[PDB]
Amino acid sequence: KLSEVRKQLEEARKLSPVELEKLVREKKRELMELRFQASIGQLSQNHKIRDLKRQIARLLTVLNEKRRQNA
RNA sequence: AGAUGGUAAGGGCCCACGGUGGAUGCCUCGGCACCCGAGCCGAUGAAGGACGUGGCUACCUGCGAUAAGCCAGGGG
Ligand SMILES: [Mg+2]
Ligand SMILES: [Mg+2]
Ligand SMILES: [Mg+2]
Ligand SMILES: [Mg+2]
Ligand SMILES: [Mg+2]
Ligand SMILES: [Mg+2]
Ligand SMILES: [Mg+2]
């Protein structure tokens, strides 16, 4: 995951506000999708959940830095 | 016609072995003292808190809806 993690910061850093907010919306739904399965059992690869929870944290963290001057 | 042994419901003392109870000894993640060092925080919202936060979490810790963590530099 470490590797596939050092990407976002880049593949996500170069997009802008309107590109992220929508990307994050997408992720947030996926997270719902998950926590929605466990409640019934299905999904069990926890690693997935926490893994997605932290992704959003990054997108937001990156979007927060962009909204401070730029253009 | 004489006689002092003897019964132990229980009791008493001595011994042996246990039960209880946690003194004693060694122990120490703790406290105490003195001496250095360092000495302020907040409406850029403090001190302290409430509630929440884990795939399953009662409590503690850590965190804050980015919630046991997010970005970057440094050490390893
Ligand atoms: Mg007699
Ligand atoms: Mg008897
Ligand atoms: Mg005992
Ligand atoms: Mg506070
Ligand atoms: Mg807590
Ligand atoms: Mg839950
Ligand atoms: Mg490093």
Classify residue A2 as exposed, middle or buried by CB count within 10 Å of its CB (0-12, 13-18, 19+): exposed
PDB resolution in Å: 3.0
Beta carbons of A60 and A24 less than 8 angstroms apart: yes
Contact by Cβ (8 Å): A22, A13: no
The CA distance from A27 to A13, in Å, is 16
For A52, list phi and psi in degrees, rounded to 5: -80, -30
**Distance, CA A21 to ligand 5 centroid (Å)?**
30
Method used to obtain the model = X-ray
Å separating the CA of residue A49 from the C1' of nucleotide B74: 31
Q: Cα(A20)–Cα(A53) distance, rounded to whole angstroms?
A: 15
Closest CA to A21 of A54, A66, A53, A51: A66
Nucleotides of B under 7 A from a protein CB: 54-56, 66-72
CA distance A44 to A35: 10
Secondary-structure breakdown of chain A: helix, strand, coil percentages, each rounded to the nearest 5: 70, 0, 30
Question: Of chain A residues 49-68, which have a beta carbon within 7 Å of strand B?
Answer: 49-50, 53-54, 56-58, 60-62, 64
